[PDB]
Amino acid sequence: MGPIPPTGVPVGDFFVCGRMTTLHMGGQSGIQATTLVNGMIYRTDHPSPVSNWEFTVLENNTIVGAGMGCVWFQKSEALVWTLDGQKLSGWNTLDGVGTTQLTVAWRQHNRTIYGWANVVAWNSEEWHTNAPHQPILRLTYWLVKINVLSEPEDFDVVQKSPLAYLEDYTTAQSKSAIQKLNFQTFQKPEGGGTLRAQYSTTPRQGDFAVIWQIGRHNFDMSTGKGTPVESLSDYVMPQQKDAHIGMWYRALTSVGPRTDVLTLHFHLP
Amino acid sequence: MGPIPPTGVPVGDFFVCGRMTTLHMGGQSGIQATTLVNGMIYRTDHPEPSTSPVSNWEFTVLENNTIVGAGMGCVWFQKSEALVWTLDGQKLSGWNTLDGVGTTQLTVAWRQHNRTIYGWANVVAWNSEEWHTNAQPILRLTYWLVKINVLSEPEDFDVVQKSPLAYLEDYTTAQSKSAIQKLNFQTFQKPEGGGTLRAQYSTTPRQGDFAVIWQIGRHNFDMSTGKGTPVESLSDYVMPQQKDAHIGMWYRALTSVGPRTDVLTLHFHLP
């Protein structure tokens, strides 16, 4: 027996495993941005309507989600498979996968690319937080297929990042809150309240990306539509989370390499 | 082809994808420890008397009663809930199981609060990846897949713990100046103080379960033998160039916070 080549589009809910490259790293002009992997562009001034984050998921002109992070990959290196229990039911490719009518708008430095990508599939997972009408914290991600080649300009902008909630802080030691997730502004060492979005290689037409948001929002697994996260602060998580969707460490780390391998799992409409 | 059941042990380098549970979360007596997933127990005082050399970290990898590595993190999983496969390029060369996988003679000693469990696990396979600093040994992330030999219930205890984070200056909880090229590791202490953090243990793996132990920091490692040096201590590091990594452990190893369990995708050189 020789090896099985990847063939056909996934039938039903599926897994994607690949090296996924962070769209931009957090920097300062003239300094290569090598570790700040979760700088999330946050812009409340606005120029279809857009969210407060870099990406906006749209049904026509209605915001149904936001993207505060983005990793991308080409179809050639991604592993794609489906399971029947523990049995392998398909060893597939993303070549020719269908898309939904949900679109993604990309807000760049001084322009917005509407129709930049279309949503293919998605996943989401909640983690109960202390609060009443407020949605609990959720991590939602969408697989998207890029429609157009757009080259983004690097620019300095307010960026939020996850971290532990630290008090009595020095670089050598701090008091770490036992139950908290924090999100704060990371500014560049020269100041200004902003951090440079230093873009790397960017997806082209037919490439794929995963965009995600984390924070208080609602989401409908059956349709891929929810609400955009409005803003980020600190959250108390009173119970353990034994999660399933595979994005949590990538979404919550303060530092990391620009690219690493991730396996994500996706639901179709 | 109809659906293929997992069949046979992996031959050659292989992948494992599954939900992996953090061995202990960073806490304080009486408070459920729900987010601090990278409290790494740091003890420079060697157990005395000791029948083997011991690292400064929770786990010591041993061969011929000599240190060949250390473990500062541990995630564990049951084999019945892991995907295991081998590749030839992008082609699938095996859809496998860890049932009946062979082990090496490299062992893992687990230093608990007041005892060390020798032979707690045997090494099955390993991987490692470097990331050059601006500097001595290179900064590396190294991990071993291990098969647990015994259920050894640990006692929760307060101890010095180090965690990764961004290098932050001019810090408040709302905003800080984040160094552009740095990784930092610092002591995280519980809010009640004392310089220590509680290791709050989860369910303990039993014989036949699997775990992944890893170390990050300056050390040497030989992919051909699975042996290297233990990381001695952790500080801050300047990374002058981008790292495009692939061993799948970097975000789990560098995050300051997270859920106790999530899916990870790792791959291993099998001796």
Q: Do B91 and A3 touch (CB under 8 A)?
A: yes
Q: Do B186 and A173 touch (CB under 8 A)?
A: yes
With beta carbons under 8 A apart, name residues in chain A contacting B248: 260-262
The C-alpha angle A99, A127, A49, rounded to 5 degrees, equals 45
For residue A251, the SS3 value is helix
Q: Do B188 and A195 touch (CB under 8 A)?
A: no
Q: A166 to chain B: nearest residue by CA?
A: B173
What is the DSSP secondary structure assignment for residue B128, as one 8-state letter? E
| CB A265 within 8 Å of CB A209 | no
Report strand pairing: B66-71 vs A14-22: unpaired
What are the φ/ψ torsions at residue B53 (nearest 5 degrees)?
-65, 145
Q: Which residue has the tokens 């157990």?
A: B47
In a domain, B4, yes or no: no
What are the φ/ψ torsions at residue B9 (nearest 5 degrees)?
-75, 150
List Cβ neighbours of B212 (8 Å cut-off, separation of 6 or more): B20, B74, B75, B76, B143, B144, B145, B146, B249, B264, B266
Q: How many CB pairs below 8 A link A and B?
A: 298
At position A171, the amino acid (one-letter code) is T
Q: Do A243 and B262 touch (CB under 8 A)?
A: yes
For residue A96, the SS3 value is coil
With beta carbons under 8 A apart, name residues in chain B contacting A33: 180-181
- Resolution as reported, in Å: 1.5
Whole-number Cα distances in Å, B162 to A66, A179, B198: 34, 17, 12
Q: Do B17 and A258 touch (CB under 8 A)?
A: no
With beta carbons under 8 A apart, name residues in chain A contacting B174: 184-185
List Cβ neighbours of A118 (8 Å cut-off, separation of 6 or more): A99, A100, A101, A102, A103, A104, A144, A145, A147
With beta carbons under 8 A apart, name residues in chain B contacting A238: 32, 34
Q: Do B175 and A161 touch (CB under 8 A)?
A: no
In a domain, B2, yes or no: no
Report strand pairing: A159-163 vs A166-167: unpaired
For residue B253, the SS3 value is helix
In a domain, A8, yes or no: no
Q: How far apart are CA B124 and CA A176, in angstroms?
A: 35
Q: Do B171 and A169 touch (CB under 8 A)?
A: yes
Number of domains in chain A: 1
Nearest CB to B35: which of A79, A180, A195?
A180
Nearest CB to B263: which of A180, A185, A244?
A244
Whole-number Cα distances in Å, A72 to A52, A75, A87, A153, B140: 21, 10, 28, 17, 25
For residues B189-218, one letter each, b for 16 or more C-beta atoms within 10 angstroms of the residue's C-beta and e for the rest, the string is bbeeeeebbbbbbbeebeeebbbbbbbbbb
Instruction: Give the method used.
Output: X-ray
Residues forming beta bridges with residue A92, ordered by sequence position: A80
In a domain, B7, yes or no: no
Instruction: Say if B245 is an interface residue toward chain A (CB within 8 Å).
Output: yes
| Tokens (6 digits) for A31 | 């300094």
In a domain, B199, yes or no: yes
In a domain, B200, yes or no: yes
For residue B268, the SS3 value is strand
Q: Do A26 and B242 touch (CB under 8 A)?
A: no
End-to-end CA distance of chain B: 31
In a domain, B5, yes or no: no
Instruction: Say if A130 is an interface residue toward chain B (CB within 8 Å).
Output: no
Q: Which residue has the tokens 């990050």?
A: B216
Q: Do A178 and B256 touch (CB under 8 A)?
A: no
Instruction: Say if A7 is an interface residue toward chain B (CB within 8 Å).
Output: no
Instruction: Say if A242 is an interface residue toward chain B (CB within 8 Å).
Output: yes
Whole-number Cα distances in Å, A102 to A143, A226, B202: 11, 12, 41
Residues forming beta bridges with residue B141, ordered by sequence position: B129, B216
For residue B188, the SS3 value is strand
In a domain, A216, yes or no: yes
Q: How long is chain B?
A: 271
Question: Which residue range forms the structural domain that includes residue B81?
Answer: 14-268
